[PDB]
Structure formats: C-alpha cells, structure tokens
Coordinates of C-alpha atoms and ligand atoms in Angstrom, one line a residue:
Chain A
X8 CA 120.0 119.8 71.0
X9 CA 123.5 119.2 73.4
X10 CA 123.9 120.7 76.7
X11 CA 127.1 121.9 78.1
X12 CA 128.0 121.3 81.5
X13 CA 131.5 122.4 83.8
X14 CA 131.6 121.6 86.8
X15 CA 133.6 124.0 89.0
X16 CA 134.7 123.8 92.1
X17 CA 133.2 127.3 93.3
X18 CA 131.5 128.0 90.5
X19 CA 129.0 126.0 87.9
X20 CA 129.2 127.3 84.3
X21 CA 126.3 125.2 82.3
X22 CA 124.4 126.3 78.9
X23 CA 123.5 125.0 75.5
X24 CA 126.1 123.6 72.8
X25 CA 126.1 126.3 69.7
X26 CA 126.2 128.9 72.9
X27 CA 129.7 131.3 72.3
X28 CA 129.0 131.1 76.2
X29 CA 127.2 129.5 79.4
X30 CA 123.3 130.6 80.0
X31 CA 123.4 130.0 83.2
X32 CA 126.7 130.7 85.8
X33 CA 126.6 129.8 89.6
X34 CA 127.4 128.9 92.8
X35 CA 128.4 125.2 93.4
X36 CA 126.8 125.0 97.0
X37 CA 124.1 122.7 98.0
X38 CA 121.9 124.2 101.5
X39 CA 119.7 121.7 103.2
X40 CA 117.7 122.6 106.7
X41 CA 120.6 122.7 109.9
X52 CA 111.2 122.8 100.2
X53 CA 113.7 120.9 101.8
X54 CA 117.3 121.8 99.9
X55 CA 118.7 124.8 98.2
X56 CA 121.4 125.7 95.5
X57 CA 123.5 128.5 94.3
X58 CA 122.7 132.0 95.6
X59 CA 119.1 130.9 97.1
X60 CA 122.0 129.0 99.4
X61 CA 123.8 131.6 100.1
X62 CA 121.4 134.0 100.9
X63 CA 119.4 131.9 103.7
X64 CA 123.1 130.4 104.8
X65 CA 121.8 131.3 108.4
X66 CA 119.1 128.7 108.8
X67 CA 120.7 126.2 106.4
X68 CA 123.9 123.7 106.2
X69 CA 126.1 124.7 103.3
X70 CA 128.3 122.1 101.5
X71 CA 130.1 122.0 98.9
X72 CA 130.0 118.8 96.5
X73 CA 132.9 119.3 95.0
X74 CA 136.2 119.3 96.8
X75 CA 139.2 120.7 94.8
X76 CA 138.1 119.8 91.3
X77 CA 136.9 116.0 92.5
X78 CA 133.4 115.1 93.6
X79 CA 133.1 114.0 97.1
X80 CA 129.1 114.7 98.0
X81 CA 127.1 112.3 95.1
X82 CA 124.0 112.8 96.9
X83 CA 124.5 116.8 96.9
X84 CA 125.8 116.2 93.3
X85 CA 122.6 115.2 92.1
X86 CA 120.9 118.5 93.6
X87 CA 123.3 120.9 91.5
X88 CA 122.8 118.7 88.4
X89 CA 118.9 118.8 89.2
X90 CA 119.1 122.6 89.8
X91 CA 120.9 122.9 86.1
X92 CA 118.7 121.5 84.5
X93 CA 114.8 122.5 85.6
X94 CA 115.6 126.0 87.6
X95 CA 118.6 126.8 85.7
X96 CA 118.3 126.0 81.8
X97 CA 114.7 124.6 81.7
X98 CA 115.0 122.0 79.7
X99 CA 114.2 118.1 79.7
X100 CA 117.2 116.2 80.7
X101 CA 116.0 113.3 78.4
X102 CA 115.7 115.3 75.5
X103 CA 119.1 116.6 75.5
X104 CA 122.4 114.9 75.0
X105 CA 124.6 116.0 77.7
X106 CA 128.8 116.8 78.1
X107 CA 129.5 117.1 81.3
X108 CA 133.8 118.1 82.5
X109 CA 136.0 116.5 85.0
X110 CA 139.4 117.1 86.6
X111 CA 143.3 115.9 85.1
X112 CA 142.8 112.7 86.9
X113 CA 140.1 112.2 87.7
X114 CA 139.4 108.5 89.6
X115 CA 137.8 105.4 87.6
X116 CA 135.3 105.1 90.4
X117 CA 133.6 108.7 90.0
X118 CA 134.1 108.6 86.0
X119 CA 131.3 105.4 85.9
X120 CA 129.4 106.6 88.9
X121 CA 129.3 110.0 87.0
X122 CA 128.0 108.7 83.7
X123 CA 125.5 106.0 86.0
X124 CA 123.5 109.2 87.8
X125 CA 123.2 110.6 84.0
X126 CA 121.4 107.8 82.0
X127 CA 119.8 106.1 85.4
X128 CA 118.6 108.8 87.4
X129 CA 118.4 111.3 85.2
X130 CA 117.8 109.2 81.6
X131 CA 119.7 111.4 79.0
X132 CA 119.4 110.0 75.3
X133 CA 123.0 110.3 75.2
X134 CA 126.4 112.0 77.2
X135 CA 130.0 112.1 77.5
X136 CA 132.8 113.7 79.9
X137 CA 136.0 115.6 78.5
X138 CA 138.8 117.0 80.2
X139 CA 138.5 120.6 81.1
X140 CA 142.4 121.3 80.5
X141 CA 142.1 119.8 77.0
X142 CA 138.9 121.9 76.2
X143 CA 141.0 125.2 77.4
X144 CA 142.9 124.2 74.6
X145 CA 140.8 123.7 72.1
X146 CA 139.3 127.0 72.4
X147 CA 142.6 128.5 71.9
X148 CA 143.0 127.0 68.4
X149 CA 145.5 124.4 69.8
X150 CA 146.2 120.3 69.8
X151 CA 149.3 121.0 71.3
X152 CA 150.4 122.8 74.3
X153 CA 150.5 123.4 78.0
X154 CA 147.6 124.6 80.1
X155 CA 146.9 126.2 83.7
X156 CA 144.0 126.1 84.5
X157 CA 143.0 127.4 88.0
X158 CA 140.2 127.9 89.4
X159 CA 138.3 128.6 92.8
X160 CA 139.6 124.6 94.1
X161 CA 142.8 123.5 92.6
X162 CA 145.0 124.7 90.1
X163 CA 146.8 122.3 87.6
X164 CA 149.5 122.0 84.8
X165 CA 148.2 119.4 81.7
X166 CA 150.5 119.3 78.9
X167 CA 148.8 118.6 75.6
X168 CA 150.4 116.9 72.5
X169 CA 148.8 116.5 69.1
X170 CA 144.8 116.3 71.0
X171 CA 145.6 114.2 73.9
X172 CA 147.3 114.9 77.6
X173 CA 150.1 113.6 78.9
X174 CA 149.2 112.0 82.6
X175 CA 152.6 111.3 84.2
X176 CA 153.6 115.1 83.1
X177 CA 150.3 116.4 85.2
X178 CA 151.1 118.4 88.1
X179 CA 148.1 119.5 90.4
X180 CA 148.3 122.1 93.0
X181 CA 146.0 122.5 96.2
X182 CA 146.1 126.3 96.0
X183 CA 143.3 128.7 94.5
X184 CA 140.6 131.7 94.3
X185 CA 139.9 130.5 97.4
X186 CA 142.9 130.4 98.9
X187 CA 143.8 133.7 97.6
X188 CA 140.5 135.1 99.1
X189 CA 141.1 133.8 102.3
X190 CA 144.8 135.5 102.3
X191 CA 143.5 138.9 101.4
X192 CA 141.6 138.1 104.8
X193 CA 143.8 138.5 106.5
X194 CA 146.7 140.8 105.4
X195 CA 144.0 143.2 105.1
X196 CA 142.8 142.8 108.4
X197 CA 146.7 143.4 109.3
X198 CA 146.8 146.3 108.2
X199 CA 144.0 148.0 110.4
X200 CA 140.6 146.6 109.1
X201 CA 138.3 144.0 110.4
X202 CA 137.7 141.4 107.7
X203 CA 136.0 137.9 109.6
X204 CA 132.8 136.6 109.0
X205 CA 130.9 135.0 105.7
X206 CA 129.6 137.9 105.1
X207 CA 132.5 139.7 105.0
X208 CA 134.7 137.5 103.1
X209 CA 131.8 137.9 100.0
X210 CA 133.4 142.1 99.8
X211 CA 137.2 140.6 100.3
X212 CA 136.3 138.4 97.1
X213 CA 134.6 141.5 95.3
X214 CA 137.6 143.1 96.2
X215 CA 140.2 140.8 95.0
X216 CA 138.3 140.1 91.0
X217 CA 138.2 144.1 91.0
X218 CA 141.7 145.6 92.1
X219 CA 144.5 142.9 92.6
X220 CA 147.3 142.5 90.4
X221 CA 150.3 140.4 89.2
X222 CA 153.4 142.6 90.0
X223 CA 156.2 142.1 87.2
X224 CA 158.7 143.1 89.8
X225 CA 157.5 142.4 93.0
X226 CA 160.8 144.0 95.4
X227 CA 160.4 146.8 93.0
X228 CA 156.9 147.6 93.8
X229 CA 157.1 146.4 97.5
X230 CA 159.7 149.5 97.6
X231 CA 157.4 151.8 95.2
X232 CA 154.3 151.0 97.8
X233 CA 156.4 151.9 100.9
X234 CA 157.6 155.5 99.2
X235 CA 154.9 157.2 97.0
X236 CA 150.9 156.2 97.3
X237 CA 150.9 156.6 93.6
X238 CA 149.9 152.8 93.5
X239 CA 146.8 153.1 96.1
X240 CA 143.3 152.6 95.4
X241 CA 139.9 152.9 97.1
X242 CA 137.1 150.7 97.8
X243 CA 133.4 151.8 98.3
X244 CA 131.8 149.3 100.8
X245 CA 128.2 148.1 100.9
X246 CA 127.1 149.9 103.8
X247 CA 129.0 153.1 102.4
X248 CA 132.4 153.4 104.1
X249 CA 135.2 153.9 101.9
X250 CA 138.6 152.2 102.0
X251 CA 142.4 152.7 101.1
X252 CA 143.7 149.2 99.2
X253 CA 147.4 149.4 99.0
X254 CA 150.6 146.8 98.7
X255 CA 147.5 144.1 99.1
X256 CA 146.8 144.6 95.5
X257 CA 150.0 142.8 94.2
X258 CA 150.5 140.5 97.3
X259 CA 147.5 138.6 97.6
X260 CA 147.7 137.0 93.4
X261 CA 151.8 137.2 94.3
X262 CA 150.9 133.6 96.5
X263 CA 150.7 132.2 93.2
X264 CA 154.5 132.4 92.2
X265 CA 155.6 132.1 96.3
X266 CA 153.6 129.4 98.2
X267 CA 155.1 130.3 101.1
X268 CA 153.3 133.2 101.8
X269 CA 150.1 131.1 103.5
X270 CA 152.6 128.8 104.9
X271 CA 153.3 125.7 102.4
X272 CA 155.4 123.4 101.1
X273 CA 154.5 123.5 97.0
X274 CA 156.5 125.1 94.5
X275 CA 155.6 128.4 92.5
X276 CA 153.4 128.0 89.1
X277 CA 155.7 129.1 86.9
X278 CA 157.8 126.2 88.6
X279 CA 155.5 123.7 88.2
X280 CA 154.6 124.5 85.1
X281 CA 158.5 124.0 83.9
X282 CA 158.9 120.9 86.0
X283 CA 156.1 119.4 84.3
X284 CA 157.3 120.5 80.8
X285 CA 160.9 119.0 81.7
X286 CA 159.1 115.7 82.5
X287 CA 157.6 115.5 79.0
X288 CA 159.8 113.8 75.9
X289 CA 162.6 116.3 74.5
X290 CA 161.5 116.6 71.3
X291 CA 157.8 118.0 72.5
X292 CA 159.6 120.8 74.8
X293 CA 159.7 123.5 72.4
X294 CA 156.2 123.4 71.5
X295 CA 154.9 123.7 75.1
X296 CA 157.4 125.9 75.9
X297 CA 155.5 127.7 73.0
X298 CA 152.0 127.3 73.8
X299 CA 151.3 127.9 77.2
X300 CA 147.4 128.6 77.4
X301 CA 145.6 129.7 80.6
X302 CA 141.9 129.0 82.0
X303 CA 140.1 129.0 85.2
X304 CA 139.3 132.3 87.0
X305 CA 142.1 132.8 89.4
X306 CA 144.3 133.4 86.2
X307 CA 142.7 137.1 85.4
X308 CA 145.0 138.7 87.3
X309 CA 146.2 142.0 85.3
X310 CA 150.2 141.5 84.3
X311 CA 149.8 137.7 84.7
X312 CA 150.8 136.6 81.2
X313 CA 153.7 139.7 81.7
X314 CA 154.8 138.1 85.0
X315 CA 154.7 134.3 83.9
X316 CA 156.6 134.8 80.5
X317 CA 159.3 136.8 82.5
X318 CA 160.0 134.0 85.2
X319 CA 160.0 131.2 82.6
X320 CA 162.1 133.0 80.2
X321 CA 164.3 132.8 83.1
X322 CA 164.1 129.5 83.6
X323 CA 164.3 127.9 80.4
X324 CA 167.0 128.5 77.8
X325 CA 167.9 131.9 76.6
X326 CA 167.4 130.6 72.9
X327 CA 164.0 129.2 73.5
X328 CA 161.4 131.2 72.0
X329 CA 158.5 131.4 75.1
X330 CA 154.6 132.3 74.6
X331 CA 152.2 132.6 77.2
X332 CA 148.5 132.5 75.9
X333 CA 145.9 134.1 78.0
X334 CA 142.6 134.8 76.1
X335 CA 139.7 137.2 77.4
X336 CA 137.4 134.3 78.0
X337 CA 139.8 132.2 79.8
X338 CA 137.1 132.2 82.4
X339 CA 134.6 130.0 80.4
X340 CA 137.7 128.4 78.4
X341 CA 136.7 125.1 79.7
X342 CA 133.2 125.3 78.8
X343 CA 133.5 127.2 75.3
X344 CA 136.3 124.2 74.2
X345 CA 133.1 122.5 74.6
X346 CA 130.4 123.9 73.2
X347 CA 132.2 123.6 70.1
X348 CA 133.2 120.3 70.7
X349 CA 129.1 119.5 71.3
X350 CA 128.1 121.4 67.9
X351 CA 130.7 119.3 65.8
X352 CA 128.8 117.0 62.8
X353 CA 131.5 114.3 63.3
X354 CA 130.9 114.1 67.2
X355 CA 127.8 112.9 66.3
X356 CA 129.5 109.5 66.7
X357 CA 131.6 110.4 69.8
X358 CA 128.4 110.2 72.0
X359 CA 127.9 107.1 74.6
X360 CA 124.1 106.4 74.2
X361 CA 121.9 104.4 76.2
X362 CA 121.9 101.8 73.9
X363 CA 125.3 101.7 74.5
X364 CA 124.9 102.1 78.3
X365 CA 122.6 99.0 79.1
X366 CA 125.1 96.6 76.5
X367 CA 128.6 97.4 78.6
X368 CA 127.4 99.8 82.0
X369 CA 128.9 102.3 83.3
X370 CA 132.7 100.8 82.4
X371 CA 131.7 102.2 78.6
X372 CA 132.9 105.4 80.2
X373 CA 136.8 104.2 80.0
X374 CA 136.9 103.3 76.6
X375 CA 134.8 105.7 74.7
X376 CA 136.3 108.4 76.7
X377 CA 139.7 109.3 77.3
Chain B
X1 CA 135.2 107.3 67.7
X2 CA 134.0 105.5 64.1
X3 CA 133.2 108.4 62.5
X4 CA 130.7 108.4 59.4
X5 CA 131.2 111.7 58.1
X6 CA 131.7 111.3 53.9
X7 CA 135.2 113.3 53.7
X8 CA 136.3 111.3 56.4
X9 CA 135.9 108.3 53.7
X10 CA 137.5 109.9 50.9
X11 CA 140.2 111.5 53.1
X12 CA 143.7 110.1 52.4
X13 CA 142.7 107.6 49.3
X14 CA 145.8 108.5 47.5
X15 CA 148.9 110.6 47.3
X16 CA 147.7 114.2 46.7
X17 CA 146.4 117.9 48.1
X18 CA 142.8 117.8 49.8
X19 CA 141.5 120.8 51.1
X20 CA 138.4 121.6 53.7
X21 CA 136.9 125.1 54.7
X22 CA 135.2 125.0 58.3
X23 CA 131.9 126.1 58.1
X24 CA 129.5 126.4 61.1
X25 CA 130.8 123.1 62.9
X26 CA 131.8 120.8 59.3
X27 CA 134.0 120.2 56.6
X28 CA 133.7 121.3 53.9
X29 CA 136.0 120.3 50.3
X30 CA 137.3 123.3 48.7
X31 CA 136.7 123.1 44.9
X32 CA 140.2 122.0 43.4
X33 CA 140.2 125.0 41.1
X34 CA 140.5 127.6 44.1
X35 CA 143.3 126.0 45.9
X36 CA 145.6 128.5 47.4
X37 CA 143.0 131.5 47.7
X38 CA 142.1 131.6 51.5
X39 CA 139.7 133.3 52.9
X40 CA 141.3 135.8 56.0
X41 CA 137.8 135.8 57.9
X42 CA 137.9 131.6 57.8
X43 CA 139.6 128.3 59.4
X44 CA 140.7 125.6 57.3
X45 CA 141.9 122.4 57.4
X46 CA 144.7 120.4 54.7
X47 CA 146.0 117.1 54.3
X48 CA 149.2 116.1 52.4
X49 CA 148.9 112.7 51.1
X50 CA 152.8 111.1 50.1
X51 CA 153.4 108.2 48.2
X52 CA 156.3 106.5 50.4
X53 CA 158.5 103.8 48.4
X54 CA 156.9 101.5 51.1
X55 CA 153.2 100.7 49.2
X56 CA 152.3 102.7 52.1
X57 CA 150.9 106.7 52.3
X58 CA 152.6 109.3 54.5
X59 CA 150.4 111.8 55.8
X60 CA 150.7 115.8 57.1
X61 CA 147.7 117.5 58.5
X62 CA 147.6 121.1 58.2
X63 CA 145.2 123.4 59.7
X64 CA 145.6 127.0 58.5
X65 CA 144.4 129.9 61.0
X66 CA 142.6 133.1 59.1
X67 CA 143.7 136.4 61.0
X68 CA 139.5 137.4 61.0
X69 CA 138.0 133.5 61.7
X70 CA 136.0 133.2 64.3
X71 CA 136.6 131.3 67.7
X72 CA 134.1 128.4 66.6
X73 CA 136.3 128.0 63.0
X74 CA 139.8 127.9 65.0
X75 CA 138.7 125.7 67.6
X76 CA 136.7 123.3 65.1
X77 CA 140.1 123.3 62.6
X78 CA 142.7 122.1 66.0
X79 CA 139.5 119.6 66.5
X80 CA 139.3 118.3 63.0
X81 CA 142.9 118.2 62.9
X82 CA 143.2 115.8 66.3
X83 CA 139.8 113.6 64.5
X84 CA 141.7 113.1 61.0
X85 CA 144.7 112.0 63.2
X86 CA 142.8 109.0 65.0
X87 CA 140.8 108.8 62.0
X88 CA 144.3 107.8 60.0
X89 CA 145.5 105.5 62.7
X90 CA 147.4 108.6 64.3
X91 CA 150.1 108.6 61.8
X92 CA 149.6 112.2 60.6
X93 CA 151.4 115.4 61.9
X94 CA 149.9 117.7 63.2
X95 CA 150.6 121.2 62.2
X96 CA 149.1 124.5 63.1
X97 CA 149.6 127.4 60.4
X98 CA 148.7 130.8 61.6
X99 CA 148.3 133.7 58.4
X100 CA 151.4 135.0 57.8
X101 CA 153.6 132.8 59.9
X102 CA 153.7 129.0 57.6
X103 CA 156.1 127.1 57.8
X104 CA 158.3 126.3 54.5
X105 CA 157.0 122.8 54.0
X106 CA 152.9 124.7 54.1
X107 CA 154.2 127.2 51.7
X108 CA 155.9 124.9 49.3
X109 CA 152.5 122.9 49.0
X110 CA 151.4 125.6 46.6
X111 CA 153.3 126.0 43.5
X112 CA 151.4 129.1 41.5
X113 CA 151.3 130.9 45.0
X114 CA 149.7 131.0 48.0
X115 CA 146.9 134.0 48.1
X116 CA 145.1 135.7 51.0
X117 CA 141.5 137.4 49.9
X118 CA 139.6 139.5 52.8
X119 CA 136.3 138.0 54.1
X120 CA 134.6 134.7 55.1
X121 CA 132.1 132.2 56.3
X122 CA 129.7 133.7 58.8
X123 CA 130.3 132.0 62.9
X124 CA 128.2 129.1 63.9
X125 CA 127.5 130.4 67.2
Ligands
ATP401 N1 139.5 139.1 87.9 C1 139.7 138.0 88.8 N2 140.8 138.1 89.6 C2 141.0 137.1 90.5 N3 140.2 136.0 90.6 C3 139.1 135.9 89.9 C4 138.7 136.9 88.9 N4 137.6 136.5 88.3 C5 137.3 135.3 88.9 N5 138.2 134.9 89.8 C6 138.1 133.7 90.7 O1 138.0 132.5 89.9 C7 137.3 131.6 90.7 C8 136.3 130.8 89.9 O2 136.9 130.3 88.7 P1 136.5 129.0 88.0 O3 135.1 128.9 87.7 O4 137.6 128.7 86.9 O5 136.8 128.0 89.2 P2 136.3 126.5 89.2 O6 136.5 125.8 87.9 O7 134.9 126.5 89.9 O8 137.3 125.9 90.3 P3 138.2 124.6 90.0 O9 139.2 125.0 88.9 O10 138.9 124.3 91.3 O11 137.2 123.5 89.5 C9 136.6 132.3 91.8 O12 136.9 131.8 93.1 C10 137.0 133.8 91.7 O13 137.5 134.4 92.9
CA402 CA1 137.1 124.1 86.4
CA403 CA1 134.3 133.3 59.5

C-alpha cells in the first residue's frame, strides 16, 4: 500500500494513500546532543541539552544528513511501517533544484530501498484537491509562501513568484508588537504561546484604516488570552495587524510586494487568453492562509486590481491546511497511477536522472 | 506515463459520446442507455470525440462536478481529465462542469435532456 509524504517547512504532514488525511502531523526539527538524535516534539521538549536544526530552509532542503532522520522518524516511530514494502510520494517546492530532485529520489531507493516512489509539486496537488486542472494557487506555509499558476494539469515556471515571508514570520512579528504594547514576549518558550495565540485569535481585516480607527475608539473588538501558568491577557489591534504583513511587507521592514500583488503580477505574466480562468480560480493552501476574512480581504483587493468586468473567485477550502497532502493521497490511490511510479527497476537502468523525465 | 488502463485503450477510437463514472479511485463506462442521468452524490468524467474534415479526431474532455460527490470523486475527475489529455497527445480541452452551471457546448451534448437524480457512489477514502 502507497505512503504519502509533505514535507513542510515547520511542519511534516505524512500518512497512508486512501487516508482523507495525514496519520501522523509534526515538527520538522532534528535535535542531536550540543540515543544520540531526536525529532519533532521529543526535540522540542529536551531543546535545552540539544542542538535544534531545521532541515528544511524555506520550502528547500539544505541539511541531507538531518533529512534522513525526519524521513527515518516517519517511517518506524511515526507510521510504523516497512519503507520497502511501501511505495512512497514524497512533495517538493515550485522550483525546486535538479540537484536535490535526484539526490531526493537517491536516499529513497538507496538508503532507504522503497519498491517504488515519486515527487509531485505541492501547489499542483492543492489543486487537485479543489477539483481543478486549472488555476492559480497560494500556498503559504510556516517557510515561504508562493504563487503557481496552473493550466490544464501542469504549472507555469516563468509565471512562479516565491515569497520569503511566512507563519514564521508572522509569529515572530506578533513578538514583538505585543511586547510593545506592555508585555514581555522573548524567549523559545515564549514564542510557542505567541504562536498558540496567533492560530487562535488573529484575523484578516477587510478594511484595515477602518478597524485601526474602530480599535482606537470602542474595545468592542478586544479579546482575552488565558496563559499557561494562569495569567490572563487583553489581545487587541494585534489581532488584524500581525496576518495584515501579508498584504503590506513593509511592516517587518522589506522590500517585497503584497500577495494579492504578487499574485496579479504573476497572473499578468501568464498568456492572455489563460487570464480569465486564473483570475477565476484562485485556490489557497498552506497554514498561514487560515486567517478568518482572508478569502473576503484577497477578493476585495484583486477586484480592485483587475478589471471591473472580470468575474474574480477566491477558493479557500477547510482543509487547505493538508491541501498538499490530500491532492495526494488521491493522486497515490488512482488505478492508472499505477504506471506513473519510478521503480527500482527503473532506478538501477537510468539513476537518479529518471527523476527529470518521469516527473515533472 | 504509458498507462495500461483498458478505457484508456478504447478512449477516443472514433467520433462519438463516451461516458465514465468515478468510482473509488477508477473509471468507470456508463452504460450507453443511461446517458444524461447523473448521479448528484457522483464525479464524472466525458469525452467528445469530432470527426474533423482533416482524417483527423477533435477531442473535448469534460469532467462534470455532482453538488453531493465526494472530495476523492472531484479530485480523481480534474486528475483523469489532466491523464486523458497526455494520454491523447494533449490535444483535448479541458473543461470543468460544475451541476447547474454547464456551459452551452456540455448541455447541447445531450439531445433528449440532461437529468439530475439524488444519490451516488459511496467515497474511496
Ligand atoms: N489558524 C491559523 N492562523 C494562522 N496561522 C496558522 C493557522 N494554522 C496554522 N498556521 C500556521 O501554518 C504554519 C504551518 O503550515 P504548513 O504546514 O502549510 O507550512 P509548511 O508547509 O511546513 O511550510 P512551507 O510552506 O514553508 O513548506 C505554521 O507555522 C502555523 O503557524
Ligand atoms: Ca508545504
Ligand atoms: Ca459519491
């Protein structure tokens, strides 16, 4: 039976193809002494007398060595299963380099001897969940954020627009307008309730002068926050400001443009006659996206962009979180992708350059 | 990307209507007689075969979205759709039908009518 397998930046969403979602959901941090390594939460927790990395650096992976650990971790602690028993789709980034594509599928069928494996695009698999061949998706996650336009199946790679802002990011931020304000928010520790914080209460404002002048008059938009040790807290304008980053770079001191800016630029730099379709299909993954009034807030500022004629549709499901991975698990269960696989077979004839030309 | 699957074989022989029901990740043929009776709680998937004055076949891909079908069956259809494309040397177009909203051309396939009937093909998930 097929494995899924994306690989987030933050987060690692893995399970088994037929799945409607992932078995098993973590943290993409590999700990080793400052047995002898640790991944996920077991990380996390002894972070004092270990040395936290991160294999995966804005959607790309930098750390092969660590890479092999999370992979490892998947697969015996994880899902509990025999690697070479399983066929197993694994995810990349929109552009992802030759060089990691082959050393990717190498660790696979060498180091870890799967029957059989193959690596789709998690932009295109966001898309396939929705129902779609064609359209335009942002997927944002913990790392990077990105704009793939999709026509009939397949992306367009000169249209691609990635963007080094993210849950992270946005994290970080809340950090520290937070603090601002009259709290003390610092250490690793503390950074862990600023994200609990951010998933629960932050919001996309529609209008966001409008409610910058509604949070300075009434406290009808103020909520509280019930810390671990017990002390209570008031979250107020720091709801809408910290997903607002998203739209206004410029807020943690960049240069980039907004997202519903890049998201036009990279429609405009498509062919004309595809415009109106992604214009019309505009599907959103990762997790940074499930911000309340995002889909409100993007389809307002594009609207304004684009022509007033053009009919515009932004697409944001529940389970945009596990998109990627859903788009597939379906893909994995198909009885014509029975073919699609690159088997070992396959592997010791070409090597890992089979990669390029099997998958796109 | 050779794919084996028998429908595959027989898709696009010769100018006609062929009709496929997803159901729990495969295609399926409709039988001919209940063309134009879709089942809400289902995905399927059409191809529009045209003889061109060329010799050669013109091909439009359809795949129809039920209001009730399932995740799997909507995802499965846009994949189908983007496999009988390659499949056909990529010269179909690709169209997606949602229940209620078809275009003219999707409508106009179906000359006694084009029926919706409640229910459906259990998920595969
Ligand atoms: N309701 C929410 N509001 C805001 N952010 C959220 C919410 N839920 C999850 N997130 C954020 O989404 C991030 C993880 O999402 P995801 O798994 O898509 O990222 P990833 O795929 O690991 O990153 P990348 O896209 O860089 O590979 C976390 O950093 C988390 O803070
Ligand atoms: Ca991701
Ligand atoms: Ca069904």
């Amino acid at each position: 039976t097929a494995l899924v397998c994306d690989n987030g930046s933050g987060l690692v969403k893995a399970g088994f193809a037929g799945d409607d979602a992932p078995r098993a959901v973590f943290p993409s941090i590999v700990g080793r002494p400052r047995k002898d390594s640790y991944v996920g939460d077991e990380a996390q927790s002894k972070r004092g007398i270990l040395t936290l990395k991160y294999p995966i650096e804005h959607g790309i992976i930098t750390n092969w060595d660590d890479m092999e650990k999370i992979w490892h971790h998947t697969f015996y602690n994880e899902l509990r299963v025999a690697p070479e028993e399983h066929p197993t789709l694994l995810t990349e980034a929109p552009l992802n380099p030759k060089a990691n594509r082959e050393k990717m599928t190498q660790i696979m069928f060498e180091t870890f001897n799967v029957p059989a494996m193959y690596v789709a695009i998690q932009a295109v698999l966001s898309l396939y969940a929705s129902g779609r061949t064609t359209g335009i998706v942002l997927d944002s996650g913990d790392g990077v954020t990105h704009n793939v336009p999709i026509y009939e199946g397949y992306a367009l790679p000169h249209a691609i627009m990635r963007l080094d802002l993210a849950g992270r990011d946005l994290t970080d931020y809340l950090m520290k307008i937070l603090t601002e304000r009259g709290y003390s928010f610092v250490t690793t520790a503390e950074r862990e309730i600023v994200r609990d914080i951010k998933e629960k209460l932050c919001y996309v404002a529609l209008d966001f002068e409008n409610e910058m002048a509604t949070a300075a008059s009434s406290s009808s938009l103020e909520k509280s926050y019930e810390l671990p040790d017990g002390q209570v807290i008031t979250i107020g304008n720091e709801r809408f400001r910290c997903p607002e980053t998203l739209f206004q770079p410029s807020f943690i001191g960049m240069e980039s443009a907004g997202i519903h800016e890049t998201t036009y630029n990279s429609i405009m730099k498509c062919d004309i006659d595809i415009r109106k379709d992604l214009y019309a299909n505009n599907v959103m993954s990762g997790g940074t996206t499930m911000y309340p009034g995002i889909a409100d807030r993007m389809q307002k500022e594009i609207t304004a962009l684009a022509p007033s004629t053009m009919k515009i549709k932004i697409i944001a499901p529940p389970e945009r979180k596990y998109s990627v991975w859903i788009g597939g698990s379906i893909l994995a269960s198909l009885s014509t992708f029975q073919q699609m696989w690159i088997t070992k077979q396959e592997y010791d004839e070409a090597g890992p350059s089979i990669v390029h030309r099997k998958c796109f | 990307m050779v794919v084996e699957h028998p429908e595959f074989l027989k898709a696009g022989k010769e100018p006609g209507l062929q009709i496929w029901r997803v159901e729990k990740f495969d295609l399926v043929p409709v039988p001919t007689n209940l063309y134009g009776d879709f089942f809400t709680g289902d995905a399927y998937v059409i191809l529009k075969t045209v003889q061109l004055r060329n010799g050669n076949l013109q091909y439009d891909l359809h795949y129809w979205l039920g209001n009730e079908c399932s995740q799997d069956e909507s995802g499965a259809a846009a994949i189908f759709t983007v496999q009988l494309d390659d499949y056909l040397n990529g010269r179909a177009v690709q169209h997606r039908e949602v229940q209620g909203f078809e275009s003219a051309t999707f409508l106009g396939y179906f000359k006694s009518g084009l029926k919706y009937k409640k229910g459906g093909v259990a998920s595969g998930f």
